[PDB]
Amino acid sequence: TLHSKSSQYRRLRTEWKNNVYLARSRIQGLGLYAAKDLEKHTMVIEYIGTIIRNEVANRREKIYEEQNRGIYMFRINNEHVIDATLTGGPARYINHSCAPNCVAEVVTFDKEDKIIIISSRRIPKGEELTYDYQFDFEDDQHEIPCHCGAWNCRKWMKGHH
Ligand SMILES: Nc1ncnc2c1ncn2[C@@H]1O[C@H](CSCC[C@H](N)C(=O)O)[C@@H](O)[C@H]1O
Ligand SMILES: [Zn+2]
């Protein structure tokens, strides 16, 4: 079926290169933009990387912090993180917004769990892609100023300089 989840994912693997482009962000550093008008609830790009445990992720983040380099991770849940720092794709440049246009959802395809960035509304060509990073207050991580610039911006987020 053309509109099934598995078919959407299969189309994603061939189309994602045409959905997005990397450019200077209107938020911070580099960001990811819609290369074309994207319909609502459409799969945009997969957050690829290496699935690791919290223990492993915290040890990696220390390693990275000692280098002059960005850290690129997506937390799936309390147990696992996708580390995109070494093996990620352009989805790792997607910035946080307190008022985002995309959502990240787990999708299972041929025996694997995947994080797919999905539009939560129509996105015009040239608009920056964002999702909400999901920083819970219960300690866990550090936190930096948020510069997403939205009206309801919580002024803080999880991350690094
Ligand atoms: N709304 C926002 N406000 C401030 N910093 C942000 C942000 N969204 C993303 N970032 C920064 O981007 C990182 C997440 S990865 C996003 C890619 C990053 N902009 C880059 O050019 O490499 C975090 O370390 C954070 O510092
Ligand atoms: Zn914000």
Residue numbers in the entry: 5380 to 5540
How did the manuscript describe this experimental structure?
The final construct used for structural determination, MLL4(tag), encompassed residues 5,384 to 5,536, followed by a C-terminal 6xHis tag, and crystallized with S-adenosylhomocysteine (SAH) cofactor product. The crystals diffracted to a resolution of 2.2 Å and belonged to the space group P21. The catalytic domain of MLL4(tag) adopts the canonical β-fold structure observed for other SET domains, and closely resembles that of MLL1 (Dillon et al., 2005; Southall et al., 2009; Xiao et al., 2003b). The N-flanking region of MLL4 forms an extended helical structure, and is markedly different from the extended loop observed for MLL1. The C-terminal tag immediately follows the conserved Cys4Zn cluster and enters the substrate binding channel before turning and passing over the cofactor. The lack of methyltransferase activity observed with the C-terminally tagged construct can be attributed to partial blocking of the substrate binding channel and interactions with the cofactor. In MLL4(tag) the SET-I region, which retains the conserved fold observed in MLL1 and other SET domain structures, is in a position that is more consistent with the “closed” conformation proposed for an active SET domain (Southall et al., 2009). The consequence of this position for the MLL4 SET-I region is that the four-residue motif, termed the channel tetrapeptide (I-Y-M-F in MLL4), is 3.3 Å closer to the conserved active-site tyrosine that flanks the target lysine side chain (Tyr5512 residue in MLL4) relative to MLL1. Inspection of the MLL4 structure reveals that several side chains of residues in the postSET loop are oriented toward the SET-I region, and some are capable of making hydrogen bonds with it. From this we infer that when associated with WRAD, both proteins adopt a similar optimal conformation when fully activated. This implies that the structure of the isolated MLL4 SET domain, with respect to the positions of the SET-I region and postSET loop, may represent an intermediate state, which is partially stabilized by features unique to MLL4.
